[PDB]
Amino acid sequence: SPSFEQQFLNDKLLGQNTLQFTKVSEKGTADALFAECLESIRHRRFKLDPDVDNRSSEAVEKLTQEERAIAEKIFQRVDPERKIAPRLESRGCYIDPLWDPFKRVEELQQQVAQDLTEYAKLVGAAEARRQRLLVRASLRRQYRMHDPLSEGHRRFFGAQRADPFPTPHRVHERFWDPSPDVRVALKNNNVPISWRDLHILHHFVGENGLILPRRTTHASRYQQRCIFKAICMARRMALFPYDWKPTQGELMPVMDPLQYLVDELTSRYKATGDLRADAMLCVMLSKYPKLNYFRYLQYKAQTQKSEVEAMQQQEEEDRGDFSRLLRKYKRATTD
Amino acid sequence: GRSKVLIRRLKERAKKEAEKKA
Amino acid sequence: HSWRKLQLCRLLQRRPFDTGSPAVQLACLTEKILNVRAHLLRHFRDQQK
Amino acid sequence: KYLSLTQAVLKKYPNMRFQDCYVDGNDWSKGNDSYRADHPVMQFVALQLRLMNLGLDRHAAFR
Amino acid sequence: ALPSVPALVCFYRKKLYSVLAPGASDVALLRFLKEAADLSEVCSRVSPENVAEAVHGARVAAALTETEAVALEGAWAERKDVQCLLTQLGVAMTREQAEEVQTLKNELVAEDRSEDAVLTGGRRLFAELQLQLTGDSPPDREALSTLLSDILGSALSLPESLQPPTGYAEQWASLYQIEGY
Amino acid sequence: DVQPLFTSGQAYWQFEIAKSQANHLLRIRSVLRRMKAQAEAAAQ
Amino acid sequence: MNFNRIPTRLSTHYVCDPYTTLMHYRRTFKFLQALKAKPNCRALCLGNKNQVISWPKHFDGLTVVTSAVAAQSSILSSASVYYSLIICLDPVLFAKHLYRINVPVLGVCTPREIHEHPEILKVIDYLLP
Amino acid sequence: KSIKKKITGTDNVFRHIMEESFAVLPEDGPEFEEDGGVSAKQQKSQILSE
Amino acid sequence: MNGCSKRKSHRLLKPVFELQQSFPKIQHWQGAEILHRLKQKEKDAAVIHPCIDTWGDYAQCLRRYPATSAARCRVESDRHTRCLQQHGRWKPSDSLEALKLLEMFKVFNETARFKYPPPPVHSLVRGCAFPFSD
Amino acid sequence: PVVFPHTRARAGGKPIMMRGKSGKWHWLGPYWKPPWAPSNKARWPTGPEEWAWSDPTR
Amino acid sequence: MSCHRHVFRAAPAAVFASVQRWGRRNNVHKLTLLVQTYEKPCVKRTRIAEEKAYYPRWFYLRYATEVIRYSLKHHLRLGQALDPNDDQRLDA
Amino acid sequence: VFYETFVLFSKRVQRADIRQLLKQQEALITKHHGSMLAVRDLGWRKTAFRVIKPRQGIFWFGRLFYFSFGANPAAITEMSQSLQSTNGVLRHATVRMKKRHNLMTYNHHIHARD
RNA sequence: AGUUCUAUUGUGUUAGCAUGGUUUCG
RNA sequence: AUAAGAAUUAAAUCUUAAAAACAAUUCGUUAAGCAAAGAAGUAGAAAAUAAGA
């Protein structure tokens, strides 16, 4: 009985993002046994399910284009340094686990898998494969319309792009609004910008090679002066161009290349979790012990401690559901 | 103008003649 | 220059942190005048000084 | 005093700008943050200033 | 907040003192261990002559040179240093440990350590003053007068009864000369 | 018929996305069961 | 949506506060009662076309100045013969014409108008917020 | 690449690091974890079981 | 169930004819000259007709080539077809000049030769005399 | 204590830029704040932006 | 620097127009004319003062004309001052 | 007074030449009462443009070195003149070390926020 | 207001340098 | 003489010329003296200079 992930999530688009709805428990635990019982009972009730439970309504434009623009602006103001996105992995922070609307999605996927396997049992494997291909095509078609704030939604619903009301190009400094990337660049790391920050100076120089004005860079006056000095010194040292933006090979900061490599591998292992980056950092830890691995080691320790805490919690639950989970609500509210 | 150019032309001619002689 | 002014202050001060008493002010102004005179003897073209 | 109280409350709770986002009167663009008297931000700052007049500190009134 | 590992940190009574970072020399490691032992101080230390043999045996078990042997012997034979003595004396003064302060002050005053006068003079004077003040009997004013004059670089501010009874560049540099701590 | 109230707009964004995904799955399941019924009727 | 100066100071309106409005009502009630206690007295009402169609645009008071040399002349000069009370709803618009008018004037206006043109208090005799 | 504009004689320290890494992590092994980073681990800690 | 409880009257959702930014008042003639430059750079298409120039070009090309016009005149033919399809139902614009539209907003500064008109009184005055006695 | 404020008269005068084609400041620079000037808070109502550096030390 | 444009699946006239736009927004012709002949310092003072006074006015009037064109295109009506105390309640 | 010096040697420069230059710089530091703090190699880096060094040739990259030293302010002019006179060195720059943004302390996570 | 220290310096004098109009050389 | 370059409202002076090293255009390399193109809103604190025509 192939599941939804077994059937359809091996495609590129479908397999890209795959949220987790339930904790994974190793075979031989009370959680695993209860999950098995629930799956069996749910499959049997799917067999003895009525027609009214699969009623669906036609899809319509969730938002107008102007309302989408307003929502995007408000989300950006909420998170001015980061990009707005449906962080369905961080979902638990915003929506309480008990009120997750994705349990319906999980159960519907289970039902679709059961329906497809029964159809294969009845009509034939070739027809089942035809239907699986058709369902894959439909999922690919409907992949990019789920997000009301995406361009896929607009394209699917055939809505013309909004024509925003004109705004002034020359406004007061009070209203200047940089993009998140320019904002991160300008803030640097809470440190004034130096010529050694060759990874960022490209933002404040135009394609013509001329240094951008303050109205364009959206930098404070002190920051503008610091950036001008940094660019002038880099140019005099011949690590920054004079008449164009730096080549992609010139973007390393003025620092130790091996420390840069360690930083990049740590960033990869934290953002996505590259096992290759983890192995490279592990070997570098001993091969070059004169570099700085504080963040990498701290993340490793945090993960190990979280694993130990989860194991202790599982042992407590096996002995009997203890007051930890109840506290996560009652004690948190009392605090 | 018409002084530096003439002087430099004469200088180049003299230098070429001397180098050829040498 | 700051070290020399500190020494004069410790010589002529009311108490450990007294730097505004007129005696200490006189000492510091004298030291500053001497420093600027030396700087002018070097950079004789520095008119603002 | 609302000019600063509203900024403080918005910086603590950015999500208050969603409320009545489509209603004329609430200007949430950067550099303005001027809400209607019936906006949650305005009610919050009004209650805080009322408590301050009653004689509490800014932080106590905020809490 | 260790930049890298493995590392050896040393805390002197809940206070960071030194950190030996990864990839250090054997001589540096031995100096670290010796300094830790000195600061801390049945129990004994290997002789500085045999320190090289001990290190070689430890290396063999875990798995010498003419200059390495001499360096190890000298490092292990060195006595306490200015940083250790000053830190110990400061902590003892803050803890009002009379006997400690006394012993540490005597060690610092020892003649062989006179080379470190420029670094130890103020601490020595203030240790003497603190001992005199903390003495159970009321402080002797005559004794206090000498130390106070030494510290202040003068005796014009003391009570009268307790007071004890050429070149251009030289003359113009004498102005900035004050002899108090 | 009655849906919950959240404190942030992120929650409503994800709620709407989940609703759309569930409705698409419902359409697929209904079509599959209709095909099931048609096949059963044809066989019988 | 806005790219202009943001004011930092708000001015109170004592003339149009609750107690001041109550006093305005109390003082105007007595004058209105006394006026109505006398017979054959008409009250003129002036407003703006955008705040009132049915209302006539011409009356006895209106003078309808037509010459350039008569620009300075008021248009409500003769209202005193016919009327014993002018109830005005556009004091800002009619200020130059209600100035030193020989009949009592009861003006209705907003605190914003009063503060932006305080000179209307020199042409208004009774105020009803 | 041009011989008169490129860099030659440099160590391939990164390639050596990759080759040594192959020892701890087989080259024919998974490229990611079950939970892909901070966000995935947050999801794991914030999803309930049955 | 949950949803907005007030009208979606936001001026972004319902754009309105207004200047959202103020600016120190400009001399009237300077502003007029700047607006004239802007209009010239835009080339307001108030010509006899957008299709007239395309037709003229097509006819001139046909006259120049009386034999091989079938192959010569194809770019012109496509341009004329596009112009007919786009501006076929073309009506000359009937609106006030931007100069007057901005005088309405009071953007400019009164000079010696330009003054804003005084508020209308004759047209706006509405009088209602009623009896008030007894 | 009740003490009057000090005078707003300062030595040297006001910034002057040398006449001619040099561009040199005969006295003071372009960032000079005159004594008769409003407060910094008055002149900069917004205050530091969210992307400015909290610590200005280099 | 020198702007480089690739004439690919486009008209050479269009690419030349883009190059002209780049030159105009970079003031290349202005600088060439300035350096072709000597400008005395006082003339430069007057010119810079004139430009600094003039261009903001042009930008504001450009914004105004853009708003006018948008309103004419979208048949927008003149605004009325938002009356406060309006409940702004849906008629539903 | 603490300073940091950055040098860009050409490919023609050798380890022996680098050692000789560093020895000369430390000699100047000691003469001016200073002390060399640290020396580091920042690897081979391509130049943003071709360096046409007169009477030496044309180069398209360089090896970057850094050394930090405390010395009397009077030593900087001599050090700069010596580095300028040196042939192999393509470019050099000496600055006053800063409390926060210096290669001694602000040496990691200059580009990676997390 | 003044003195000392503190963080910052498109201010004035400074040895040298990176870049560039122009002229120059082939 | 003449053409070309250059320039001009249009011309002329001027430079080169007959296969070219420096009249003019294109490409490299140094050399010399010289040095505010690019980065700061005289705007926004209520902050406002002179009865009238």
PDB file of C-alpha atoms in Angstrom, chain A residues 140-266:
ATOM      1  CA  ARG A 140       2.061  19.872 -10.669  1.00  0.00           C
ATOM      2  CA  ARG A 141      -0.564  22.166 -12.196  1.00  0.00           C
ATOM      3  CA  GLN A 142      -1.951  23.134  -8.777  1.00  0.00           C
ATOM      4  CA  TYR A 143       1.427  23.351  -7.006  1.00  0.00           C
ATOM      5  CA  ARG A 144       1.972  27.112  -7.291  1.00  0.00           C
ATOM      6  CA  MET A 145      -1.616  28.342  -6.774  1.00  0.00           C
ATOM      7  CA  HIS A 146      -1.887  27.464  -3.071  1.00  0.00           C
ATOM      8  CA  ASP A 147      -0.027  30.579  -1.889  1.00  0.00           C
ATOM      9  CA  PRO A 148      -2.348  33.620  -2.120  1.00  0.00           C
ATOM     10  CA  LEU A 149       0.630  36.018  -2.062  1.00  0.00           C
ATOM     11  CA  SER A 150       2.593  34.278  -4.842  1.00  0.00           C
ATOM     12  CA  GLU A 151       2.680  34.966  -8.569  1.00  0.00           C
ATOM     13  CA  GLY A 152       1.585  31.399  -9.279  1.00  0.00           C
ATOM     14  CA  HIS A 153      -1.758  32.181  -7.644  1.00  0.00           C
ATOM     15  CA  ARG A 154      -2.245  35.246  -9.847  1.00  0.00           C
ATOM     16  CA  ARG A 155      -1.255  33.328 -12.980  1.00  0.00           C
ATOM     17  CA  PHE A 156      -3.591  30.444 -12.137  1.00  0.00           C
ATOM     18  CA  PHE A 157      -6.563  32.734 -11.518  1.00  0.00           C
ATOM     19  CA  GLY A 158      -5.765  34.926 -14.526  1.00  0.00           C
ATOM     20  CA  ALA A 159      -5.733  38.183 -12.557  1.00  0.00           C
ATOM     21  CA  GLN A 160      -4.071  41.215 -14.117  1.00  0.00           C
ATOM     22  CA  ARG A 161      -1.230  42.780 -12.154  1.00  0.00           C
ATOM     23  CA  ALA A 162      -2.140  45.787 -10.028  1.00  0.00           C
ATOM     24  CA  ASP A 163      -1.325  49.262 -11.333  1.00  0.00           C
ATOM     25  CA  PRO A 164      -0.211  51.058  -8.149  1.00  0.00           C
ATOM     26  CA  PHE A 165      -0.882  54.745  -7.644  1.00  0.00           C
ATOM     27  CA  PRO A 166       2.162  56.930  -8.435  1.00  0.00           C
ATOM     28  CA  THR A 167       4.476  57.830  -5.560  1.00  0.00           C
ATOM     29  CA  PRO A 168       7.243  60.446  -5.382  1.00  0.00           C
ATOM     30  CA  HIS A 169      10.773  59.492  -6.360  1.00  0.00           C
ATOM     31  CA  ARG A 170      12.242  62.272  -4.175  1.00  0.00           C
ATOM     32  CA  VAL A 171      10.796  61.830  -0.682  1.00  0.00           C
ATOM     33  CA  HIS A 172      11.978  62.735   2.810  1.00  0.00           C
ATOM     34  CA  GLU A 173      14.515  60.594   4.647  1.00  0.00           C
ATOM     35  CA  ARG A 174      11.764  59.656   7.109  1.00  0.00           C
ATOM     36  CA  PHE A 175      10.068  57.580   4.398  1.00  0.00           C
ATOM     37  CA  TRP A 176      13.083  55.974   2.685  1.00  0.00           C
ATOM     38  CA  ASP A 177      12.522  52.211   2.648  1.00  0.00           C
ATOM     39  CA  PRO A 178      15.406  49.887   1.711  1.00  0.00           C
ATOM     40  CA  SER A 179      14.962  46.278   0.692  1.00  0.00           C
ATOM     41  CA  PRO A 180      15.863  43.540   3.201  1.00  0.00           C
ATOM     42  CA  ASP A 181      19.163  42.756   1.455  1.00  0.00           C
ATOM     43  CA  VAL A 182      20.257  46.403   1.370  1.00  0.00           C
ATOM     44  CA  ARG A 183      19.162  46.681   5.004  1.00  0.00           C
ATOM     45  CA  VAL A 184      21.307  43.714   6.048  1.00  0.00           C
ATOM     46  CA  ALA A 185      24.247  45.074   4.058  1.00  0.00           C
ATOM     47  CA  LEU A 186      23.977  48.534   5.624  1.00  0.00           C
ATOM     48  CA  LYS A 187      23.697  47.177   9.153  1.00  0.00           C
ATOM     49  CA  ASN A 188      26.675  44.861   8.466  1.00  0.00           C
ATOM     50  CA  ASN A 189      27.061  43.000  11.810  1.00  0.00           C
ATOM     51  CA  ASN A 190      26.554  45.984  14.126  1.00  0.00           C
ATOM     52  CA  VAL A 191      30.068  47.105  13.123  1.00  0.00           C
ATOM     53  CA  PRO A 192      30.976  50.136  10.976  1.00  0.00           C
ATOM     54  CA  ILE A 193      31.896  49.156   7.433  1.00  0.00           C
ATOM     55  CA  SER A 194      35.582  48.846   6.513  1.00  0.00           C
ATOM     56  CA  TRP A 195      37.448  48.283   3.259  1.00  0.00           C
ATOM     57  CA  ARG A 196      37.791  44.629   4.325  1.00  0.00           C
ATOM     58  CA  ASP A 197      34.052  44.107   3.683  1.00  0.00           C
ATOM     59  CA  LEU A 198      34.500  43.383  -0.017  1.00  0.00           C
ATOM     60  CA  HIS A 199      31.454  41.077   0.070  1.00  0.00           C
ATOM     61  CA  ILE A 200      29.080  44.055   0.436  1.00  0.00           C
ATOM     62  CA  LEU A 201      30.597  47.116  -1.281  1.00  0.00           C
ATOM     63  CA  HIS A 202      29.037  46.069  -4.602  1.00  0.00           C
ATOM     64  CA  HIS A 203      25.586  47.108  -3.349  1.00  0.00           C
ATOM     65  CA  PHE A 204      26.507  50.793  -3.083  1.00  0.00           C
ATOM     66  CA  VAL A 205      28.228  51.086  -6.489  1.00  0.00           C
ATOM     67  CA  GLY A 206      26.302  51.398  -9.729  1.00  0.00           C
ATOM     68  CA  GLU A 207      26.820  49.400 -12.892  1.00  0.00           C
ATOM     69  CA  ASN A 208      28.668  52.472 -14.184  1.00  0.00           C
ATOM     70  CA  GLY A 209      31.168  52.106 -11.327  1.00  0.00           C
ATOM     71  CA  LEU A 210      30.109  55.360  -9.659  1.00  0.00           C
ATOM     72  CA  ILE A 211      29.396  55.241  -5.929  1.00  0.00           C
ATOM     73  CA  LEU A 212      25.664  55.495  -5.319  1.00  0.00           C
ATOM     74  CA  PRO A 213      24.177  58.540  -3.550  1.00  0.00           C
ATOM     75  CA  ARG A 214      22.525  58.398  -0.157  1.00  0.00           C
ATOM     76  CA  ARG A 215      19.009  58.741  -1.583  1.00  0.00           C
ATOM     77  CA  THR A 216      19.654  55.473  -3.447  1.00  0.00           C
ATOM     78  CA  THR A 217      21.643  53.566  -0.809  1.00  0.00           C
ATOM     79  CA  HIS A 218      19.276  54.502   2.062  1.00  0.00           C
ATOM     80  CA  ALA A 219      22.255  54.748   4.423  1.00  0.00           C
ATOM     81  CA  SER A 220      22.822  57.120   7.307  1.00  0.00           C
ATOM     82  CA  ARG A 221      25.292  59.946   6.751  1.00  0.00           C
ATOM     83  CA  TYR A 222      27.932  58.287   8.942  1.00  0.00           C
ATOM     84  CA  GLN A 223      27.403  54.958   7.170  1.00  0.00           C
ATOM     85  CA  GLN A 224      27.664  56.699   3.796  1.00  0.00           C
ATOM     86  CA  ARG A 225      30.985  58.288   4.745  1.00  0.00           C
ATOM     87  CA  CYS A 226      32.324  54.984   6.084  1.00  0.00           C
ATOM     88  CA  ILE A 227      31.316  53.148   2.900  1.00  0.00           C
ATOM     89  CA  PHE A 228      32.900  55.838   0.720  1.00  0.00           C
ATOM     90  CA  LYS A 229      36.166  55.538   2.652  1.00  0.00           C
ATOM     91  CA  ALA A 230      36.070  51.736   2.474  1.00  0.00           C
ATOM     92  CA  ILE A 231      35.524  51.752  -1.291  1.00  0.00           C
ATOM     93  CA  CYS A 232      38.280  54.317  -1.851  1.00  0.00           C
ATOM     94  CA  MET A 233      40.782  52.291   0.179  1.00  0.00           C
ATOM     95  CA  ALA A 234      39.811  49.029  -1.533  1.00  0.00           C
ATOM     96  CA  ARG A 235      40.229  50.655  -4.943  1.00  0.00           C
ATOM     97  CA  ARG A 236      43.649  51.997  -3.957  1.00  0.00           C
ATOM     98  CA  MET A 237      44.591  48.483  -2.821  1.00  0.00           C
ATOM     99  CA  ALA A 238      43.364  47.085  -6.177  1.00  0.00           C
ATOM    100  CA  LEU A 239      40.920  44.574  -4.666  1.00  0.00           C
ATOM    101  CA  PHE A 240      37.842  46.518  -5.847  1.00  0.00           C
ATOM    102  CA  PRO A 241      37.213  47.666  -9.442  1.00  0.00           C
ATOM    103  CA  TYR A 242      37.166  51.244 -10.691  1.00  0.00           C
ATOM    104  CA  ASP A 243      34.681  51.119 -13.580  1.00  0.00           C
ATOM    105  CA  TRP A 244      32.245  48.257 -12.938  1.00  0.00           C
ATOM    106  CA  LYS A 245      30.829  45.983 -10.278  1.00  0.00           C
ATOM    107  CA  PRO A 246      33.242  43.427  -8.795  1.00  0.00           C
ATOM    108  CA  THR A 247      33.456  40.056 -10.493  1.00  0.00           C
ATOM    109  CA  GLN A 248      31.905  37.105  -8.696  1.00  0.00           C
ATOM    110  CA  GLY A 249      35.422  35.927  -7.805  1.00  0.00           C
ATOM    111  CA  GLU A 250      36.256  39.162  -5.958  1.00  0.00           C
ATOM    112  CA  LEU A 251      33.530  38.855  -3.303  1.00  0.00           C
ATOM    113  CA  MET A 252      35.571  37.154  -0.585  1.00  0.00           C
ATOM    114  CA  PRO A 253      36.046  39.404   2.468  1.00  0.00           C
ATOM    115  CA  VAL A 254      39.595  40.381   3.352  1.00  0.00           C
ATOM    116  CA  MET A 255      40.274  37.560   5.808  1.00  0.00           C
ATOM    117  CA  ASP A 256      41.679  34.044   6.007  1.00  0.00           C
ATOM    118  CA  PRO A 257      40.293  31.888   3.156  1.00  0.00           C
ATOM    119  CA  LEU A 258      40.100  28.811   5.388  1.00  0.00           C
ATOM    120  CA  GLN A 259      38.129  30.735   8.007  1.00  0.00           C
ATOM    121  CA  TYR A 260      35.849  31.887   5.187  1.00  0.00           C
ATOM    122  CA  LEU A 261      35.405  28.250   4.154  1.00  0.00           C
ATOM    123  CA  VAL A 262      34.574  27.256   7.735  1.00  0.00           C
ATOM    124  CA  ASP A 263      32.010  30.065   7.933  1.00  0.00           C
ATOM    125  CA  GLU A 264      30.397  29.057   4.637  1.00  0.00           C
ATOM    126  CA  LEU A 265      30.223  25.382   5.610  1.00  0.00           C
ATOM    127  CA  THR A 266      28.638  26.318   8.942  1.00  0.00           C
TER     128      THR A 266
END
